[PDB]
Structure 1
Amino acid sequence: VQRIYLDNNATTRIDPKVKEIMDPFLRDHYGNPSSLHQFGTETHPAIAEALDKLYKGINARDIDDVIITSCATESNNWVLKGVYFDECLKKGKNHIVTTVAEHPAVRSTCNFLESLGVEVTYLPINEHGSITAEQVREAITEKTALVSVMWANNETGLIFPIEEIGAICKEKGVLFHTDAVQAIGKIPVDVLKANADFLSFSAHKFHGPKGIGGLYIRSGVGLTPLFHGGEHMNGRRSGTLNVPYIVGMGEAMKLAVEHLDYEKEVVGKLRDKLEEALLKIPDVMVVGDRIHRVPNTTLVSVRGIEGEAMLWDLNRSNIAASTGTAIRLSLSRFNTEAEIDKTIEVFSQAAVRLRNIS
């Protein structure tokens, strides 16, 4: 059979080169990097190269930290609860601003902080489907410890004005965190232009393995650890290093930035080919804005057939996509134009054989 994977915002395929670079640390180089003997120090060069790739991947400075976590969910929980202890309980700055579009890893923890008594405002989305930076200004008070706005939305793909928000946050002296998981390998990511204090990411969204993530912490910014133990990662996150996934995520970051032109020029062009081909069908319509979007995502809406039935039909035809009432289709570098023509055909055939209402 020949299956079609169009659900790359849910997770991606590991690049074969990433798997290859991970194998030796799953095989004979099994030493704990904290060990003083040769099995330990033997792993250090590859770790340094992976970390270097990550730094260079997000234009982090050598003075900055890029701490290895187990996923973006860990990074988000760590920023929000850490800044809860440092600035809300200890500095009395009991206010956090975020958006309604953030991943549940951010919003649900924010709900928990509300249950403890922190006041959090979830900014409402506007009609163009994005946020404006002035919205955060209107919501930022002199008691705001942190603003957290995702770089790109996972359901629709829209890119948010992180740069301008970073300038506002910089002028007013409030910590800035951005969940950028959906941005890596899709668009250029620069922590300096964003003036970000915190940045989240997760490997399996740019063709690394599930179960490893990263939190960029800018130099000097404090954040009480979520994993206490104080041994690893400059004492900020304890636990024996996931050596294979660290190297793999480094190579995956490298490949992701090396493929940016291909992502925008080829993957984005196929997304436009696909989208335009699908909009040649009755009362369908893209949900959201079509200009300020990441190159890989289209979010299509159909008449009165709910999206989940169409997704059942496609999976029956071995074509994988996700929801977002609407259908989210998210591409990658490993899709081909033949795959897109076939998906246009199967989508139409499924659509007319679903239209038969009653």
Structure 2
Amino acid sequence: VQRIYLDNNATTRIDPKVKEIMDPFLRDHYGNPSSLHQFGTETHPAIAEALDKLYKGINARDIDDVIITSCATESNNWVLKGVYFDECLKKGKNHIVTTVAEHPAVRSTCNFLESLGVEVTYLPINEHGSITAEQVREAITEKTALVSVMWANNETGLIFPIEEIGAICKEKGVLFHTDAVQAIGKIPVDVLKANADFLSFSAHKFHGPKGIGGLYIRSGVGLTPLFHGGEHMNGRRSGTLNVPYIVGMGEAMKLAVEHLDYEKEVVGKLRDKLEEALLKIPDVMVVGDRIHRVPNTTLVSVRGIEGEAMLWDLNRSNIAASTGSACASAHTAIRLSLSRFNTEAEIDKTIEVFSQAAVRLRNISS
């Protein structure tokens, strides 16, 4: 059996170099880095190289922190609730502005904060598919504690006017956070260009293991810890370090940025090949803008066929893709998200199987 994985915005395959670099810390070098003997200290070099790969991966400065978390969801919860106790409760700024397209890790936590009496403006999405950057400008009152905007959307792949919103947040003097999970590995990420005080990212989206993530914190920005115990990570996130996953996530970061040119020149080209081959068929239109998109994702709608149906028939031919709410009723569309491991042959066969399914389910609808 030869199956084709086109759902890399749900999770990615661990790169062999990553599993490679992780194995020894699951095998013989199992010491706790917080220990003082050679079993602990023995682990510090590889840890430092990992963190340096991260700093250099997002262009963070040695003055800043790149705290290692359990996942991007922990990073988002820690940002929202931390700036809640920090600014909303203890500085009055009882307002947070974000988008309606944020991951449930953001939207749901902001919903909890509304439950705590916080006023939140969820910025409406336009027809182009992204935020204007001026929506936040007209949105920032004088009691906004934070602006949170994802770097790129997980369903549509649409990049957002970050860097611009970073400049606006610097101007009005307000905290800036970006869920950058779908940006790492796809497009370059610069915390300094973005004027971001907080940045989130999850490892299993650039071919690292699930269950580890990272939160970037600019120098001087305070964030009341989500994990108390105050021993690890300058006290900001307690708990024994996931040494293996840390190392492998450093290597996953490195390999991810070393394939950026490959991601746009090759992976994006296969995206254009598949997508363009797919809209040559009756009633199918891509959801959202096509120009400012991450190279690897396309989200297309189909005739009078729900997304889950094409997911089922595609699954029966061993091709994996997700759904994605689209335009209006929702109706659910197909999200196909490539990676650096897919080939053109897989793409041709995905167009074959796709068209066969389209006329199959489309004909059976009568």
Length-normalised TM-score, structure 2: 0.97
Matches of 2:250 and 2:34 in 1, distance apart?
A: 19
Query: How much does 1:230 deviate?
Result: 0.3
CA displacement, residues 322-355 of structure 1 (integer Å, 9 cap, x when unaligned): 0001000000000000000000000001111111
Counterpart secondary structure, 2:291:
coil
CA displacement, residues 147-173 of structure 1 (integer Å, 9 cap, x when unaligned): 000000000000001100000000111
Question: Where has structure 1 moved over 4 Å in runs of 4 or more?
Answer: none
Counterpart secondary structure, 2:288:
coil
Query: How much does 1:305 deviate?
Result: 1.1
CA displacement, residues 304-334 of structure 1 (integer Å, 9 cap, x when unaligned): 1111111100000000000001000000000
Matches of 2:305 and 2:268 in 1, distance apart?
A: 27
Matches of 2:305 and 2:215 in 1, distance apart?
A: 41
Query: How much does 1:128 deviate?
Result: 0.4
Correspondence 1:336 to 2:343 = yes
Matches of 2:94 and 2:280 in 1, distance apart?
A: 51
CA displacement, residues 242-266 of structure 1 (integer Å, 9 cap, x when unaligned): 0000000000000000000000000
Matches of 1:328 and 1:163 in 2, distance apart?
A: 27
Matches of 2:157 and 2:124 in 1, distance apart?
A: 17
Counterpart secondary structure, 2:237:
coil
CA displacement, residues 240-292 of structure 1 (integer Å, 9 cap, x when unaligned): 00000000000000000000000000000000001111111001110111101
Matches of 2:213 and 2:266 in 1, distance apart?
A: 27
Matches of 2:355 and 2:127 in 1, distance apart?
A: 29
Matches of 2:358 and 2:90 in 1, distance apart?
A: 57
CA displacement, residues 47-67 of structure 1 (integer Å, 9 cap, x when unaligned): 000000000000000000000
CA displacement, residues 4-48 of structure 1 (integer Å, 9 cap, x when unaligned): 000000000000000000000000000000000000000000000
Matches of 1:13 and 1:194 in 2, distance apart?
A: 29
CA displacement, residues 208-240 of structure 1 (integer Å, 9 cap, x when unaligned): 000000000000000000001000000000000
Query: How much does 1:121 deviate?
Result: 0.5
Uncovered stretches (5+) of structure 1, i.e. residues with no partner: none
Percent identical among aligned pairs is: 100
Uncovered stretches (5+) of structure 2, i.e. residues with no partner: 325-331
Counterpart secondary structure, 2:192:
helix
Counterpart secondary structure, 1:233:
coil
Matches of 2:174 and 2:23 in 1, distance apart?
A: 43
Matches of 1:139 and 1:353 in 2, distance apart?
A: 47
CA displacement, residues 96-128 of structure 1 (integer Å, 9 cap, x when unaligned): 000000000000010000011010110000110
Q: How does 1:237-252 map to 2 (within 5 A)?
A: 237-252=237-252
CA displacement, residues 183-207 of structure 1 (integer Å, 9 cap, x when unaligned): 0000000000000000000000000
> Which residue of 2 is the match for residue 348 of structure 1?
355
Matches of 1:348 and 1:72 in 2, distance apart?
A: 36
Counterpart secondary structure, 1:12:
coil
Matches of 2:211 and 2:76 in 1, distance apart?
A: 14
Matches of 1:127 and 1:285 in 2, distance apart?
A: 14
Matches of 1:305 and 1:291 in 2, distance apart?
A: 26
Counterpart secondary structure, 1:20:
helix
